[PDB]
């Protein structure tokens, strides 16, 4: 599990708009997953299972890390940024407050690099808890391989910060809870149906394109 290949995969990436930017990034997400070590070498059904399980968290993590240099707002991959005051009128403000306070400000205050984030996203990705996994033991070893590489990277790159590795892992419970509230809001948009959602994000919400993207 080399951290440089994890960073290389991270750097590899160059209202209704959140639903647009999410759908766009889902295609990008599959290209990042293939790049990260031992992922393509994993069964085709398991790769689907893993991407379907963490796409929400993986993207929230990417959107939070992008918004490090912007105040009270989230910088989408489309180029447009969403501010706090618009989120509160959209009826999705409380969860937007949670993302900036728990994820954006924390990533900023600790100067979390693109290598550490890549490692966290790889930990999020390799979830042995994902429903229907054929081989959950091999997914667990790979996730543990990330802990090992990240802690080693941490101590080397950041000496005299002996609690850094833990500070990175402690964002994950918060992220899991946030991802869950983020996903319920997306279901409300799909059940209400004010402005239709694109086919790939619609495929992710409903439980084709993902199978085609894998090869």
């Amino acid at each position: 599990m080399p951290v440089d290949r994890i960073l290389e995969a991270e750097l590899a990436v160059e209202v209704t708009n959140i639903c647009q930017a999410a759908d766009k990034q889902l295609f990008t997400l599959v290209e990042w997953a293939k790049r990260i070590p031992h992922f393509s070498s994993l069964p085709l059904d398991d790769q689907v299972i893993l991407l379907r399980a963490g796409w929400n968290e993986l993207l929230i993590a990417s959107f939070s890390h992008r918004s490090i240099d912007v105040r009270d707002g989230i910088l989408l991959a489309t180029g447009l940024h969403v501010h706090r005051n618009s989120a509160h009128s959209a009826g999705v403000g409380a969860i937007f407050d949670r993302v900036l306070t728990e994820l954006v400000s924390k990533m900023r205050d600790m100067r979390m690099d693109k290598t550490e984030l890549g490692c966290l996203r790889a930990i999020i990705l390799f979830n042995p808890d994902a429903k229907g996994l054929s081989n959950p033991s091999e997914v667990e070893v790979l996730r543990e391989k990330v802990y090992a590489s990240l802690e080693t990277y941490c101590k080397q790159k950041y000496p005299e910060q002996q609690g850094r590795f833990a500070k990175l892992l402690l964002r994950l419970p918060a992220l899991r809870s946030i991802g869950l509230k983020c996903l319920e809001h997306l279901f409300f948009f799909k059940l209400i149906g004010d402005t239709p959602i694109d086919t790939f994000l619609m495929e992710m919400l409903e439980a084709k394109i993902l199978h085609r993207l894998l090869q």
Binding site: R98, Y147, A166, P173, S177, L180
Partner: protein
């Protein structure tokens, strides 16, 4: 390149001590829970199995609250904040206490020494399989890790000091109280298994799993409301279930914390 200071050792010790003395009050309260019951034509046996679990949960809440009062620093925090922390942690600490009482040989869970329950008995008590299977899938995953009493106590302490909980007034104070318990877990695990460094990240990751289990617990309470199953005020308040007690107007958790 690790050390468990005398200060950390004494801290871990108080946690194990607090846990054991809370269990003492918990075991005294055993004749209070309605007994576990051939079901009569009335349908009362089902009501009896549900109430058994309900009262065991009440005992479990009282234990958590008494344990937090004994975890250093917790009582320094504002009352709003301590209520906010226990409300979110209750089900997580509840499942953690269920997992350590799981026996892989019998595939059963033992509460208060005498009450032993299988997956069937959990269903008979009114629980749904969508909640039962994750309870046992976590219990057997906690077993694989194989923790000691100090490790369980530290993990419960770290779980309490999760700053991200709904309506936490001072996230800074809570995040500050968490770090010494996290460094104490890092040190303890590294001194316990000098060869296996993955022990500590494996422990912290169990807190992420607990987040999913809370989400699954919410689905179970939603199902309980469909089934017209009435939860007592204490449980209704902690989990936001019924109109009245679910608003916190009863102020039980507050009264429990006061004394």
């Amino acid at each position: 390149g690790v050390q468990l200071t005398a200060a950390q050792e004494l801290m871990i010790q108080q946690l194990v001590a607090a846990q054991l003395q809370c269990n003492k009050r918990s075991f005294s309260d055993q004749p209070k829970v309605t007994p576990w019951p051939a079901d009569p034509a009335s349908g009362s046996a089902s009501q009896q199995r549900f109430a058994h679990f309900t009262e065991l949960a009440i005992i479990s809440v009282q234990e958590i609250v008494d344990f937090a009062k004994q975890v250093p620093g917790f009582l320094q925090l504002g009352r709003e904040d301590q209520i906010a922390l226990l409300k979110a942690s209750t089900i997580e600490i509840m499942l953690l206490e269920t997992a350590r009482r799981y026996n892989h040989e019998t595939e059963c869970i033992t509460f208060l020494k005498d009450f032993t329950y299988s997956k069937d008995d959990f269903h008979r008590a009114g629980l749904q399989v969508e909640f039962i299977n994750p309870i046992f899938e976590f219990s057997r995953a906690m077993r694989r890790l194989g923790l000691d009493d100090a490790e369980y106590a530290l993990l419960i302490a770290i779980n309490i000091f999760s700053a991200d909980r709904p309506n936490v007034q001072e996230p800074g104070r809570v995040e500050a109280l968490q770090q010494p318990y996290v460094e104490a877990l890092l040190s303890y695990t590294r001194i316990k298994r000098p060869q296996d460094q993955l022990r500590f990240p494996r422990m912290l990751m169990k807190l992420v799993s607990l987040r999913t289990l809370s989400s699954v617990h919410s689905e179970q309470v939603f199902a309980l409301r469909l089934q017209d199953k009435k939860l007592p005020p204490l449980l209704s308040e902690i989990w936001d279930v019924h109109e009245g007690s679910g608003s916190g107007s009863h102020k039980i958790l507050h009264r429990l914390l006061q004394d």
